[PDB]
């Protein structure tokens, strides 16, 4: 009722309807460690939360108090737990609670507790009606919010709402083709619907990826996706890729293309390829160029790949 940041907000020790209860201050012991000098509002709210928690008072005023406790520290899982106890015990309208959590997540989307609470509600009501849309609004403010994507995957898996997700992925990929979260979502939707075994789908996917790479040669996400959907069955299983990549090396080059080439060669050297002698050298040359010129930040890694490749193909 009385907002925590309202001009007429009153501390709990000054509220008539709370005179009967004596607050229970926090016991940090005689010689405090990492002692936080809480503000007046803060310790007032928690001193009374502790009182209500100890007495295990499952009242409406207690319910209202948890909201204030949550607003002061949305990360206090103990308060969230007590609130869920009250929600059930007091038989509170859960849609009303859905409205409430919607609001708190908007305010603090990078918090574990607020999302878990929403999950519990959706689970209770067995209703995912507003999930995909709510998440889209959060993702519209932060396209890479980890909690939001995890909640989205959960809702889709549990209630089987796959039909329109690949489209949503395309929308966001168009907005920012560098959004690694969307590429992950793309792989999430495809592998749980059609799969990457249907050659028509693998075809479509590699063409799209190669297409995005032509457009943004230095976007590591498109590359990681191409590697991830092909490394499964082995890169050497696809003979045309090798040279096709070599085709855009004089123009669409990047240390990302060079590295994929090395990845294709080491799979070749591992699957009995013709002229193994020449390929091992091609690989060791690319490794050297990477470690010394094109991608020196990973020099230790590239010298390792060079060595290991020798160690087993010399």
């Amino acid at each position: 009722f009385l907002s925590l940041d309202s001009p007429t907000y009153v501390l709990y020790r000054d509220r008539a309807e709370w005179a009967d209860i004596d607050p229970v201050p926090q016991n940090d012991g005689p010689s405090p460690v990492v002692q936080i000098i809480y503000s007046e509002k803060f310790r007032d709210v928690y001193d009374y939360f502790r009182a209500v928690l100890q007495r295990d008072e499952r009242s409406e005023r207690a319910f209202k108090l948890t909201r204030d406790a949550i607003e002061l520290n949305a990360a206090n899982y103990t308060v969230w737990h007590f609130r869920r106890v009250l929600l059930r015990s007091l038989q509170k309208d859960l849609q009303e609670e859905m409205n409430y959590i919607t609001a708190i997540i908007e305010e603090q989307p990078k918090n574990y507790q607020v999302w878990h609470h929403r999950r519990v509600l959706v689970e209770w009501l067995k209703d995912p009606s507003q999930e995909l849309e709510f998440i889209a609004d959060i993702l519209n403010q932060d396209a890479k919010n980890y909690h939001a994507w995890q909640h989205r995957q959960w809702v889709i898996q549990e209630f089987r709402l796959w039909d329109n997700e690949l489209q949503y992925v395309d929308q966001l990929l168009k907005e920012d083709v560098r959004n690694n979260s969307v590429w992950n979502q793309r792989h999430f939707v495809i592998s749980n619907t059609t799969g990457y075994s249907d050659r028509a789908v693998l075809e479509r996917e590699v063409q799209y990826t190669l297409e995005m790479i032509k457009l943004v040669p230095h976007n590591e996400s498109a590359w990681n996706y191409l590697k991830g959907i092909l490394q499964d069955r082995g890169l050497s299983r696809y003979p045309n890729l090798l040279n096709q990549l070599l085709d855009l090396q004089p123009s669409h080059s990047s240390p990302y293309l060079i590295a994929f080439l090395v990845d294709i060669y080491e799979d070749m050297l591992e699957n009995q390829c013709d002229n193994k002698e020449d390929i091992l050298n091609k690989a060791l040359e690319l490794c050297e160029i990477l470690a010394k010129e094109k991608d020196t930040i990973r020099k230790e890694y590239w010298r390792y790949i060079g060595r290991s490749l020798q160690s087993k193909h010399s």
């Binding site: 405090p32 990492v34 809480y38 899982y77």
Partner: peptide, 21 residues
């Protein structure tokens, strides 16, 4: 100093004190 006491700036870590330690 932090090992002993912190300002209200850390009210948001009131549920993470063992972490602070």
């Amino acid at each position: 100093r932090g090992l002993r006491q912190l300002t209200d700036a850390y009210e948001c870590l009131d549920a993470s004190r063992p972490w602070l330690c």
